[PDB]
Symmetry: C3
């Protein structure tokens, strides 16, 4: 018999040297303006993330969101590459710099959510100094199955 659980949470923005390592640097957050939350009913998780900041993080190849949202159900893939995840679009209120022809996207993994871009079905991580213009403001909305 299903339960429903709905919680506000505080996403943690963090950067890393690549899309594989568990070593990260936490980015200090300005005061936020829009509540981030998640809900889970049965094994179905829906997340809403919004973050705003006045200054872009220092340059790093991987830009991630951590938090207590339900962990994605997916078979763990090879440790030699980024873990397989679910690719979703995302929204920018302040313009990022994306590769030509690509759309704004995020890779939802069991361990974290990575910001990036999408072209011909392929996800490419977005560097932390390119996720906005001077500062940043973006949102991620998605539904996926939890473990």
């Amino acid at each position: 018999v299903p339960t429903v659980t709905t919680r506000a949470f505080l996403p943690r923005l963090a950067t890393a040297a690549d899309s594989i390592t568990s070593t990260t640097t936490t980015i200090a957050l300005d005061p936020q303006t829009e509540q981030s939350y998640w809900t889970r009913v049965g094994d179905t998780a829906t997340i809403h993330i919004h973050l705003v900041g006045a200054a872009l993080p220092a340059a790093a190849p991987s830009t991630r969101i951590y938090g207590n949202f339900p962990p994605l159900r997916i078979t763990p893939s090879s440790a030699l590459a980024a873990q397989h995840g679910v690719i979703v679009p995302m929204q920018y209120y302040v313009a990022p710099t994306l590769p030509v022809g690509s759309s704004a996207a995020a890779r939802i993994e069991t361990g974290f959510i990575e910001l990036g871009s999408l072209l011909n079905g392929a996800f490419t991580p977005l560097a932390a100094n390119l996720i906005g213009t001077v500062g940043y403001e973006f949102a991620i909305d998605a539904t996926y199955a939890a473990q």
Copy 2:
């Protein structure tokens, strides 16, 4: 304990002078061919909207859908701009005219759903005379958390 509610509903197509105003014009609908519906289980809402019409509405800057679907859960934003919402793709069976490089999209807000286009994560409202060719036919499919 969660409940499940699944209902057919009659979407209302309406246009407005901008993406903020509460002044709207309801568009008279042709007989519809496909059932529009929503379902809510716990706080998770899934909507299916389909509308067909033989003649495009009179040109207006904002094209909106109203109905009794579960209201989006999101922090209300400034009244000086369109309310923050969830951006989703949408489907056209009759071709629209979109900005170059953009994808067909919809902005789901607590108050209504707005048709538009999506480029580099940014949503732009689509004018009512551009949502088709002579006539129109489109669908919007999404899942989001409700209040």
Copy 3:
């Protein structure tokens, strides 16, 4: 009534066809798979995860489809003179396909099957089976929709 939750692994069946309407299909022999495909349904809300990998592209055909026991999409059946109306979603490629210029990778979810294709100005176009990869293929489809 009170909602139930059902979560199940499943074995997607890859099939090709001569168009996007016909019930005539050719089942494609699958390699050993590396990632579990599954679906879950709570109330009338279905979420699917499909992953398929193969060393060799299927023989060329205009429609590339996935069949399985996932919850059937709730949608009014449309004219038999065209592909059934469905829900269009994005999809992911681990091995590069050949898509129409300017289009994004997409899938069309129908009550009867899921079809691979591309998306441009809101319009879905089916993708031929000899173009769903390079030499071989590897892709994933993730979606949530209402079931009947």
